[PDB]
């Protein structure tokens, strides 16, 4: 509809999945709020627009169309008002910093050592599948009460939910262009129900210290639990992004450090720099790149665009974190970048609830990795490809080291 942006009509879903950064560089210069036809939605590409939409009193949360098709109702990311307040009160106890500090080290550190012990003397590894993803899912899986779900299965589930959630391509009529792309999401959810329904059955009668047991019981009148249909969409929110993103974040941080070998040596020599390295890694390739959204609740003007009430806006935080209004040469990883606010955890009432936990999982994992393999080198015989528009990270990270 907007004549000067007619080139957007030719942007494809595959191009956004393989490398969204070229199109979004144009968006940030040309139209910080722009309707992208293949996504069927306005997209916010700059830091100022993302932060304004995420915190505006005239916007509320909405799930993207493919996200809603995947999660249903009431996903914590997609609801507001009393339901959102309840779901936030449900998830927040185990994520409170003082609580996380009581047990996070005893949780993640033995998990990291267990996965490292399987390959640390091989001289070669593919760190995404052998380390980053397993540590991420095994840590959260144990916290949740899914100790008996193998890390292979948790990784499979978040990959299928990822592809379903981000199956966003639409045709000229706004209809999903890839309707068969939700089937593996439905298949994953069916498997999850078969595993988790008996656990919920048991937790209702015998509560324990698992997070999902507390989701059922916390804050309820005596003898009542939250209905499982009411909590399952937030279980799915966890089984996608909460399982996937810490692994994405540590892997992207490592890829960034490899691209600056002198900074990798700095961080290995001084592991107190690991949190700073992770924060730059999240800015450099944001794990949640363009997954979440808001919807206007009244007519509003954003970036010169007069939006009617009921207008969805996708928050492309991964693009906002390359805003050259904030950063110099943002496409380069730089451990010594002047620390600034970033949007990798979002903003507003629907900002990430698990920031403190996630940073600790990533930090401890990198601590243990650099301790066990101080001479880690990237396998330059292999290249690192990143994939994903909604959620983005490296598909593999081949490394070598002298044994
Ligand atoms: C590096 C890892 C992670 C990153 C980069 C990340 C980032 C994000 C982002 C961008 C959002 C959407 C915010 C918005 O729309 O403004 C979000 C939401 C959320 N995240 Fe995180 N996340 C990570 C890990 C986790 C973990 C491990 C958990 C749970 C233990 C978690 C729990 C949540 C929840 C519950 C929400 C929904 C909040 C709401 O809608 O009220 N996240 N996260
Ligand atoms: C924390 O997990 C999510 C965040 C935003 C969208 C989907 C998710 O599963």
Curated annotation (Swiss-Prot):
Top-level division of the source organism's lineage: Bacteria
BP-aspect Gene Ontology terms: catabolic process
Annotated substrate binding sites: 237, 241
Listed pathway(s): Aromatic compound metabolism
UniProt entry keywords in alphabetical sequence: Aromatic hydrocarbons catabolism, Heme, Iron, Metal-binding, Monooxygenase, Oxidoreductase
EC number: 1.14.14.-
Subunit: Monomer. Forms a heterodimer with GcoB.
Physiological role: Part of a two-component P450 system that efficiently O-demethylates diverse aromatic substrates such as guaiacol and a wide variety of lignin-derived monomers. Is likely involved in lignin degradation, allowing Amycolatopsis sp. ATCC 39116 to catabolize plant biomass. GcoA binds and processes the substrate with electrons supplied by the GcoB subunit.
Name of the protein described by the UniProt record: Aromatic O-demethylase, cytochrome P450 subunit
Organism: Amycolatopsis sp. (strain ATCC 39116 / 75iv2)
Gene: gcoA
């Amino acid at each position: 509809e907007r004549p000067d942006l007619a080139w957007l009509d030719e942007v494809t879903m595959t191009q956004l999945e393989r490398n969204p950064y070229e199109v979004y560089e144009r968006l940030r210069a040309e139209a910080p709020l722009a309707f992208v036809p293949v996504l069927g939605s306005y997209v916010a590409s700059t830091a100022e627009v993302c932060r304004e939409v995420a915190t505006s009193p005239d916007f509320e949360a909405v799930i993207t169309p493919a996200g809603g098709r995947t999660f249903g109702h009431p996903a914590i990311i997609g609801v507001n008002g009393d339901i959102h307040a309840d779901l936030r009160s449900m998830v927040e106890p185990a994520l409170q910093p003082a609580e996380v500090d009581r047990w996070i080290d005893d949780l993640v550190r033995p998990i990291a050592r267990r996965y490292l012990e399987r390959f640390e003397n091989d001289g070669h590894a593919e760190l995404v599948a052998q380390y980053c993803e397993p540590v991420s899912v095994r840590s959260l899986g144990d916290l949740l009460g899914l100790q008996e779900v193998d890390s292979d299965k948790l990784r499979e589930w978040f990959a299928k939910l990822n592809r379903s959630f981000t199956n966003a391509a639409v045709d000229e009529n706004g209809e999903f262009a890839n309707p068969e792309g939700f089937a593996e999401g439905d298949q994953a959810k069916a498997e999850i129900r078969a595993v988790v329904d008996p656990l919920i059955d048991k937790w209702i009668e015998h509560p324990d210290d698992s997070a999902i047991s507390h989701w059922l019981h916390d804050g309820m009148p005596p003898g009542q639990t939250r209905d499982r249909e009411y909590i399952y969409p937030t279980i799915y929110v966890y089984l996608l992004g909460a399982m996937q993103e810490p692994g994405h974040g540590m892997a992207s941080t490592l890829v960034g450090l490899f691209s600056r070998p002198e900074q990798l040596e700095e961080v290995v020599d001084d592991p107190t720099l690991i949190p700073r390295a992770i924060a730059e890694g999240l800015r450099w390739t944001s794990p949640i790149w363009s997954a979440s959204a808001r919807i206007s609740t009244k007519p509003v003007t954003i970036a010169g665009v007069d939006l009617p009430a009921g207008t969805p806006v996708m928050l492309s935080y991964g693009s906002a974190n390359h805003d050259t209004g904030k950063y110099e040469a943002p496409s380069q990883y730089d451990l010594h970048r002047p620390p600034l606010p970033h949007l990798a955890f979002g903003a507003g009432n629907h900002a990430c609830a698990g920031i403190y936990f996630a940073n600790h999982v990533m930090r401890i994992a990198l601590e243990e990795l650099f301790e066990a393999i101080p001479n880690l080198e990237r396998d330059t015989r292999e290249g690192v490809e990143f994939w994903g528009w909604g959620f983005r990270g490296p598909t593999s990270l081949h490394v070598t080291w002298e044994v």
